[PDB]
Design an enzyme around this catalytic site. Sequence first.
Site, PDB file in Angstrom:
ATOM      1  N   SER A   8      35.909  49.716  42.869  1.00 43.67           N
ATOM      2  CA  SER A   8      36.262  48.642  41.944  1.00 43.67           C
ATOM      3  C   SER A   8      35.668  48.848  40.560  1.00 43.67           C
ATOM      4  O   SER A   8      35.890  49.900  39.911  1.00 43.67           O
ATOM      5  CB  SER A   8      35.939  47.288  42.538  1.00 43.67           C
ATOM      6  OG  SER A   8      36.652  46.182  42.033  1.00 43.67           O
ATOM      7  N   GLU A  51      45.674  47.040  47.755  1.00 48.35           N
ATOM      8  CA  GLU A  51      44.723  46.519  46.792  1.00 48.35           C
ATOM      9  C   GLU A  51      44.843  45.008  46.578  1.00 48.35           C
ATOM     10  O   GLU A  51      43.914  44.243  46.892  1.00 48.35           O
ATOM     11  CB  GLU A  51      44.812  47.174  45.415  1.00 48.35           C
ATOM     12  CG  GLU A  51      44.802  48.681  45.404  1.00 48.35           C
ATOM     13  CD  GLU A  51      43.454  49.303  45.663  1.00 48.35           C
ATOM     14  OE1 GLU A  51      42.507  48.577  46.046  1.00 48.35           O
ATOM     15  OE2 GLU A  51      43.294  50.526  45.501  1.00 48.35           O
ATOM     16  N   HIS A  74      41.446  45.666  49.232  1.00 42.89           N
ATOM     17  CA  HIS A  74      40.582  46.308  48.228  1.00 42.89           C
ATOM     18  C   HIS A  74      39.177  46.414  48.809  1.00 42.89           C
ATOM     19  O   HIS A  74      38.663  45.438  49.341  1.00 42.89           O
ATOM     20  CB  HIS A  74      40.627  45.439  46.980  1.00 42.89           C
ATOM     21  CG  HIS A  74      39.901  45.927  45.792  1.00 42.89           C
ATOM     22  ND1 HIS A  74      40.327  47.022  45.051  1.00 42.89           N
ATOM     23  CD2 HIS A  74      38.769  45.482  45.192  1.00 42.89           C
ATOM     24  CE1 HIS A  74      39.474  47.224  44.056  1.00 42.89           C
ATOM     25  NE2 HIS A  74      38.514  46.306  44.115  1.00 42.89           N
TER      26      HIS A  74
END
EC number: 3.1.1.7
Lengths: 539, 539
Positions: free
Chosen positions: B199, B330, B443
């Site tokens: 991230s 995601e 994610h």
Amino acid sequence: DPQLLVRVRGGQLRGIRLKAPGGPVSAFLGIPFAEPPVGSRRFMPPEPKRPWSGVLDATTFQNVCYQYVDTLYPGFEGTEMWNPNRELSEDCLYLNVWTPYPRPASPTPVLIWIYGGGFYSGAASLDVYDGRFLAQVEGAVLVSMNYRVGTFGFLALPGSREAPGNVGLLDQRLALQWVQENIAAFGGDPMSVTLFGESAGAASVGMHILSLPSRSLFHRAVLQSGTPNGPWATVSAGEARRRATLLARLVGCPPGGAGGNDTELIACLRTRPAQDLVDHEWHVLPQESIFRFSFVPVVDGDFLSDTPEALINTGDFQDLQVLVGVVKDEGSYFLVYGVPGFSKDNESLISRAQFLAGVRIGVPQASDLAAEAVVLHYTDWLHPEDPTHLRDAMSAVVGDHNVVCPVAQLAGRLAAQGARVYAYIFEHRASTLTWPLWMGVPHGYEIEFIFGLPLDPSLNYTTEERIFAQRLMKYWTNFARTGDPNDPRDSKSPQWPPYTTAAQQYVSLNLKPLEVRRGLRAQTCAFWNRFLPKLLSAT
Amino acid sequence: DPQLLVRVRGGQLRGIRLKAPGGPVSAFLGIPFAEPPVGSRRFMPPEPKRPWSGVLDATTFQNVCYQYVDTLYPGFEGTEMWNPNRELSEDCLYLNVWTPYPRPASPTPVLIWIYGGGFYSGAASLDVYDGRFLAQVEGAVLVSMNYRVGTFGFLALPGSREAPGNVGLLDQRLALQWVQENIAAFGGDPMSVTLFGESAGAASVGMHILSLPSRSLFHRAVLQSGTPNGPWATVSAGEARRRATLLARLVGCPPGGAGGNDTELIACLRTRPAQDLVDHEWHVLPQESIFRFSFVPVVDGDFLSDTPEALINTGDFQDLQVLVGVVKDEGSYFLVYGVPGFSKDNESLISRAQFLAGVRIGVPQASDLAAEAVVLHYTDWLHPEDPTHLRDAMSAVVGDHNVVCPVAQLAGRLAAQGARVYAYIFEHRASTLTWPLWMGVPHGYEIEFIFGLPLDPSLNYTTEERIFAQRLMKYWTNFARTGDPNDPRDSKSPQWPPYTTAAQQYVSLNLKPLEVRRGLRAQTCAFWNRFLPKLLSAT
């Protein structure tokens, strides 16, 4: 022979006895339906043919209306087959009738055909529109008329008394009112009139549905490869005018720095040799382009009360039965006529830059952003330079933009408003096709089949093609009598379901039996019918 | 034990001996790398930790930097696992080191990890960032530091001396300069520094590559699920300011109708209890949204000389080895946090209208037309109301917009500029995953594997998962030592090819062996990376 002798509301006629493979056919070719629209009649709404003495001969095909003639590939069957096969002449308002020999027993359903050629060309006299098989075999009373194309049919100075527009449509409407009051005498049922046409004829059929007065003259409708609502079958008043006067001006009408007299303008135009007009026909388009025509129906607020879009959008079509469809590759044919890189003589494996340019010719009204949108949509981003892909892409932009999505926009709008709609995708490439393989199934190559040309043994198609044809003829005549292309009561295997908003069903018209499918280019057409327009109206 | 006793450039340390399944590991947790950035230091670039007397204890994990804590689903492993597991505190600038027991023989390559949490949350102290397996098993020297997130890390009043921005990045850079001058002593090679994060840590790694001064401190880079170039990892100066002062104002800084003294402003801010700031963190975003964070790196024209876009667009990355990748879904995780209709507790089969709204939350910067474009693109026009489709569509808009396309935009830009890039798509959903099936591979769910958590038997994954993990660890450490995730010289079956502009190759990272593919969402990402922007810059 009383079979070949018929009295019509205005006089006597003598047909001729034609021989179809399955038997004899009565054929009444050349029936005047109106007073020749020549001289001071040019640009004028048609007038009903005066009644004649004696026996009008009707054993032969009349003159093709005045029109541009295709050069491009001289001596090539693919183009020539579309060309006039009779003499050109402003005196061309005749129709034809084919009836089975001998006259039917009871009121047979009638199939009135409307030829198409961009609103600028075309003729019932053509070979592929030979109504003998559909009468012979399916025992149908078939009628095909001639209507004024080009300037003669559509040149308009909206609001004018003498060139008010859409007169080529009024020609067809007049042929319709004649079928009404006289088809009876050929054994036809004035109560089961099914209009059916391709390209602009389809577009035309569409306009009859959209036009009140045409309503009472037909009951069912078929629209092949064409609709009243797309980007090319109508122009506004303003553009009409703009192309009328511009055309006039190039022809010396009016001479000098004169003006402001539409009447003088038309008067002047009315003196120019027909070919003088045809000569400047193609110089009034506003941009370089394809699948765009100079003289075509105009939204006058008479024959069409508002745009076809607005009309199919709020019309009440709650009862209308309508068959509609499209071919595998609508756009292919048009590419040869103006998109650099394409030819019928090579595989036309174009470059990217060519494709980028194509997009602007093929979507002439598009702003840059909108063009970008189209390129985005048709480019294959894993291979943005594969010539083969580019090639086929170009054909799709054109075919989807002008024929497919508009068909789908109409199908859905109709269904949603009440219509019982049926849809299809002709996918069989005739074995005889003279165009290159790359064009696959080009605009207009279903006609040979619907008309039943493969039934003629000399012509030499394949037995499958023959059988195929018979099947196709069957669907048409069946939609014609019933309003359902389906095997009678006889639920003979595969069924053709009505196209519906929700299920969006259509069928594969090809050698293999019916094969129902859902969504006609659904995404792509959402692009064109829903988004693209707002893009354009923003730019 | 000299294994656990190490002298660092500023003093002595005592590690602790951890037990990984395959053996012992040395672990030096809690190493001060800088002077606590508290008090008059808040908002300031970090300063090098002063040297200490005696033996610094380093047997334990230090305090998590000051940050918002996730409520939403209290007691739920899926969210909790991301939450602080140590005490919150502005005094948190420490790093960790794991080395195999006993210290390597020769200079092992180092893997410096950068945690991610929107630039607003996160901690090396976390369970899934347990560097013991990668040191134990692949014999790597692993380092994971803490960097200031939120206002403390990024609040900025561009141009100011006392809150100049990007200090959370300078924290990481400082940890890097420390690894440089001291990792040696842990058996690490200061010459084979491979940064790697997920991230915003990935985004961070990206910024180090984009930032000159970070260059000399690392040689290889990995960026999982995140980049420096998308829509959420950077803000301009103007917005930074706008959110600094607005945040200040909500906290009473400055009090009254005062002003024009950035210094007084920061001085004032420097007195508010840490939690007062965290309390208003989320009120400075300019629109309702998801995958958008208040305080994050700012384009100051210092740490970043220009936008990451401009930088990856014209930077010279001709030598850089970079591994990059993304997970199956995601966007899923983010939907629960703010898109009406979604929850972890039901299947979130949303309505169309919900989906239409989602699009505006998920693409907050989009004008209407641009939103339309996105809807066009993700709607399935054959079923524009199928809830299941809509659902997954929403997740794709978010995931493609923020992670995937940006990854692909970076991969390609890098490759085109010289980089040797490798790409992947993590597609294995951990068996243990506590989120609902509908989020598939959310994610951040690759971390457990890269770190090697399945190797721990207590944790109970599947043997496949275990083997899988080992494979993954192998690719990383291999890219780490060589700059090619590939089996040494040992050409052991499936190969991982460099992502290239032309071929666009990437691999399926999952249970079944490598499976090369071409084009990462190629169309979709053309939409986002090429067209969408011009749409937005028009509107």
